[PDB]
Design an enzyme around this catalytic site. Structure first.
Site, PDB file in Angstrom:
ATOM      1  N   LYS A  67       0.824  -1.206   0.000  1.00  0.00           N
ATOM      2  CA  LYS A  67       0.000   0.000   0.000  1.00  0.00           C
ATOM      3  C   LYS A  67       0.856   1.253   0.000  1.00  0.00           C
ATOM      4  CE  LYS A  67      -4.347  -1.665   1.854  1.00  0.00           C
ATOM      5  NZ  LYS A  67      -4.211  -3.054   1.315  1.00  0.00           N
ATOM      6  N   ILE A 101     -22.518   4.539  20.220  1.00  0.00           N
ATOM      7  CA  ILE A 101     -22.752   3.899  18.931  1.00  0.00           C
ATOM      8  C   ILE A 101     -21.461   3.221  18.514  1.00  0.00           C
ATOM      9  CG2 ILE A 101     -23.341   4.212  16.514  1.00  0.00           C
ATOM     10  CD1 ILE A 101     -25.167   6.397  17.198  1.00  0.00           C
ATOM     11  N   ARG A 144     -10.692  18.526  22.937  1.00  0.00           N
ATOM     12  CA  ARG A 144      -9.715  18.198  23.955  1.00  0.00           C
ATOM     13  C   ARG A 144      -9.837  19.159  25.132  1.00  0.00           C
ATOM     14  NH1 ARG A 144      -6.665  14.131  23.222  1.00  0.00           N
ATOM     15  NH2 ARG A 144      -5.128  14.815  24.772  1.00  0.00           N
ATOM     16  N   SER A 175      -3.014  10.541  31.002  1.00  0.00           N
ATOM     17  CA  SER A 175      -1.943  11.407  30.521  1.00  0.00           C
ATOM     18  C   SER A 175      -1.846  12.699  31.323  1.00  0.00           C
ATOM     19  CB  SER A 175      -2.136  11.714  29.033  1.00  0.00           C
ATOM     20  OG  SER A 175      -3.197  12.623  28.813  1.00  0.00           O
ATOM     21  N   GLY A 184      -8.089  14.100  26.847  1.00  0.00           N
ATOM     22  CA  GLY A 184      -9.310  13.718  26.175  1.00  0.00           C
ATOM     23  C   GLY A 184     -10.471  13.478  27.120  1.00  0.00           C
TER      24      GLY A 184
HETATM   25 NA    NA Z   1     -19.155   5.229  19.263  1.00  0.00          NA
HETATM   26 NA    NA Z   2     -15.969   5.903  18.150  1.00  0.00          NA
END
Ligand code: NA
Ligand code: NA
Ligand code: NA
Ligand code: NA
EC number: 2.7.7.7
Length: 326
Positions: A67, A101, A144, A175, A184
């Site tokens: 690739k 989801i 963030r 972190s 995050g």
């Molecule tokens: Na999700």
């Molecule tokens: Na996700």
DNA sequence: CCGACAGCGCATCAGC
DNA sequence: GCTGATGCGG
DNA sequence: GTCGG
């Protein structure tokens, strides 16, 4: 880390291939293979000239080298180009950005014509509680968290927890504990001397954080783990802070410091710590450290009262969290 | 050739 | 109603 | 997809 212009085309391509394996083909191990390739390439401090040069790195194999040859000669990858344009696969890949989801829900939604965020909004009764919250804060959750906000969040969590019971011990890990300039989410480890591996502690803390309106929403909550949403209070007439993801875990006192170590990371630092740990005769996991006898039978858990105790057992000098990148 | 690739809490589904 | 399976997250 | 027993 090398400039994101050395091989950023290649690592972007590999990360995109990873997401489609995870979210569309439901091939979690190809997802991690591409991620691992992306990571080793993003650390490589030379502009890659060919697939064979890349194939020397661990995690880069025959197919990725191929690739890379195609991307270097053409500036694209035919398979990637095709799947980007594919209305079904692109929508499935996209819907999984909603917290709650995953691949299976995203597939089911797209099957019945639910493809966009707008489509989700018109179909609330087809969404479980977690997914409604992921939808409600879709954009906030992708933002963030600057370290300064993390400190203000920590200030609240440490205060309210001590106010509940001054004998609680709470540590913000991840972190943020290693020193990162941004985060995050917030990951809080909670313990209490009344709770050992042989003996409402979490609920009381969650309740207080809701009472002062720090925690705004609940994705899941049981006796040992809480996952939800929080938000710093806004300064009178100024822009409200984005909603943030926060997890809180209750961990037995005698397993706390193994937990703090494990959830401080980084991921790679843990591996070589375990990797050092067994070669010295010890087995470290998230919960405990144990001795590995002559045949390989792990004996009972060793008493641990601080992070350093773990380092002591395995003949390792204590390394500060800021030195735990690896 | 072919199995491993971490393993667990909680919400919810699938079966009985 | 219960028990175990699956989906999901981090 | 890649590694390795
Ligand atoms: Na999700
Ligand atoms: Na996700
Ligand atoms: Na390689
Ligand atoms: Na007290």
């Amino acid at each position: 880390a090398p400039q994101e212009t050395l091989n950023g085309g290649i690592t972007d391509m590999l990360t995109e291939l990873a997401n489609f394996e995870k979210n569309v083909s439901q091939a979690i191990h190809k997802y991690n293979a591409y991620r691992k390739a992306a990571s080793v390439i993003a650390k490589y401090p030379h502009k890659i000239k060919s697939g064979a040069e890349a194939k020397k790195l661990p995690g880069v194999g025959t197919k990725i080298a191929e690739k890379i040859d195609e991307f270097l000669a053409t500036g694209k990858l035919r398979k990637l180009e095709k799947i980007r344009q594919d209305d079904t696969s692109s929508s499935i890949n996209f819907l999984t950005r909603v917290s709650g989801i995953g691949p299976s829900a995203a597939r089911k939604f797209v099957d019945e014509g639910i493809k966009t965020l707008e489509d989700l909004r018109k179909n609330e009764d087809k969404l479980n509680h977690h997914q409604r919250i992921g939808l409600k804060y879709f954009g906030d959750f992708e933002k963030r968290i600057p370290r300064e906000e993390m400190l203000q969040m920590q200030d609240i969590v440490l205060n309210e927890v001590k106010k509940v019971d001054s004998e609680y011990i709470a540590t913000v890990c991840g972190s943020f504990r290693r020193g990162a300039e941004s985060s995050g989410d917030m990951d809080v480890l909670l313990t209490h001397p009344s709770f050992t591996s042989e003996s409402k502690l979490l609920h009381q803390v969650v309740e207080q954080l809701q009472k002062v309106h720090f925690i705004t929403d609940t994705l899941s909550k049981g006796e040992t783990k809480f996952m939800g949403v929080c938000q710093l209070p806004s300064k009178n007439d100024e822009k409200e802070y984005p909603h943030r993801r926060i997890d809180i875990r209750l961990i037995p006192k005698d397993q706390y410091y193994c937990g703090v170590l494990y959830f401080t990371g980084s991921d790679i630092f843990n591996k070589n710590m375990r990797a050092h740990a067994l070669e010295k005769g010890f087995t470290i996991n998230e919960y405990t450290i144990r001795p590995l006898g002559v045949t390989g039978v792990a004996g009972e858990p060793l008493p641990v009262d601080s992070e350093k105790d773990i380092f002591d057992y395995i003949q390792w000098k204590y390394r500060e969290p800021k030195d735990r990148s690896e």
